Amino acid sequence: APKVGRLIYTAGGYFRQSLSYLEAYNPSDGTWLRLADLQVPRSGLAGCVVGGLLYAVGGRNNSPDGNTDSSALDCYNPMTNQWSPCAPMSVPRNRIGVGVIDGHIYAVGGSHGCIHHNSVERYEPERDEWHLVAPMLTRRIGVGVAVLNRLLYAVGGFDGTNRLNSAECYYPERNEWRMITAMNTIRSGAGVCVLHNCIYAAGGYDGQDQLNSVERYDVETETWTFVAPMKHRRSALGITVHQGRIYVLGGYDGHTFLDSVECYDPDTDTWSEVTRMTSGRSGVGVAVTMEPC
Numbered sequence: 395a396p397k398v399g400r401l402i403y404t405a406g407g408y409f410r411q412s413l414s415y416l417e418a419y420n421p422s423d424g425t426w427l428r429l430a431d432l433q434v435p436r437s438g439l440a441g442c443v444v445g446g447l448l449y450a451v452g453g454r455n456n457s458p459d460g461n462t463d464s465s466a467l468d469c470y471n472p473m474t475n476q477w478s479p480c481a482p483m484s485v486p487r488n489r490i491g492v493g494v495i496d497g498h499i500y501a502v503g504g505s506h507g508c509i510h511h512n513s514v515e516r517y518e519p520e521r522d523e524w525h526l527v528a529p530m531l532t533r534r535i536g537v538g539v540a541v542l543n544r545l546l547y548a549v550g551g552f553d554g555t556n557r558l559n560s561a562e563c564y565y566p567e568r569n570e571w572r573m574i575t576a577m578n579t580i581r582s583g584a585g586v587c588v589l590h591n592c593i594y595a596a597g598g599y600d601g602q603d604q605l606n607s608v609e610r611y612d613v614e615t616e617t618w619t620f621v622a623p624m625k626h627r628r629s630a631l632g633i634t635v636h637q638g639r640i641y642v643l644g645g646y647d648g649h650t651f652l653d654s655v656e657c658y659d660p661d662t663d664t665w666s667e668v669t670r671m672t673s674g675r676s677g678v679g680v681a682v683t684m685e686p687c
């Protein structure tokens with residue numbers, strides 16, 4: 395699984411307005427590279443990687459003139475430093491969550507104006523087609539999504555009335571969603587990822603304050619356990635895993651748009667500041683793939 399020359403890509407984001415940046419961080423030497431801008435600015439999107447290609451999914455273009463929720467799927471090839479449009483999703487999805495099962499991209503929840511989706515759809519890259527699958531049991535915007543052992547988890551979010559501590563799991567062979575144990579803490583816009591045999595939920599927003607607490611769901615024991623908290627409270631953060639460590643990027647803490655990137659080491663249960671982004675921003679999409687050539 396580990397290979398040399400992989401970077402942490404951050405796409406889009408929000409600061410005053412939705413952003414077009416694509417920038418890549420190299421943990422091996424601490425450098426940032428600025429790459430090809432997104433064709434359309436977008437915040438509240440999600441990123442993922444299939445077959446060494448980076449995908450930017452959903453979001454919203456919050457611009458000086460208006461707010462346009464995105465149904466777009468766009469693909470970045472590091473070999474060419476170019477974005478290519480793909481088939482669009484069935485519906486615009488801002489504040490989206492995304493996960494990949496066996497090379498297929500799942501787009502989960504999100505908002506379209508005042509509409510809060512429980513719908514879910516699945517993208518087939520070779521066929522360039524989206525199709526709807528079973529909807530979630532709960533409408534979730536700002537939902538955290540991660541895949542472990544070819545099961546897809548949807549964690550927290552906002553249903554239009556309450557921020558959520560609930561979570562649920564999608565079982566592909568049954569096309570069926572089931573509730574799992576609820577988190578200890580209500581979290582909207584948390585960073586959600588997979589590390590070892592646990593689903594981590596870092597930070598988020600409870601309608602009052604941004605959070606620095608982090609908790610992980612053990613898919614075997616079905617319990618949520620707090621780990622060491624992040625140094626900086628944040629919601630609408632980006633998150634990814636690289637070489638056995640969690641990286642959180644940016645977000646909003648109620649006072650500033652963070653540029654800080656923290657790295658969690660599960661062997662020592664400690665966070666450390668590893669770098670800063672080129673500028674503070676929230677609502678980014680993040681994924682890991684090979685460096686451009």
Ligand SMILES: Cc1ccc([C@H](CC(=O)O)NC(=O)Cc2ccc3c(c2)CCCC3)cc1
Nearest residue numbers: 438489536552582583599629630646676677
């Ligand atoms: C991508 C995403 C995911 C979840 C959320 C949730 C959605 C909810 O619970 O209302 N909200 C937050 O976290 C709070 C927040 C986050 C970013 C910003 C602000 C407020 C205000 C200033 C602009 C930036 C927002 C965005």
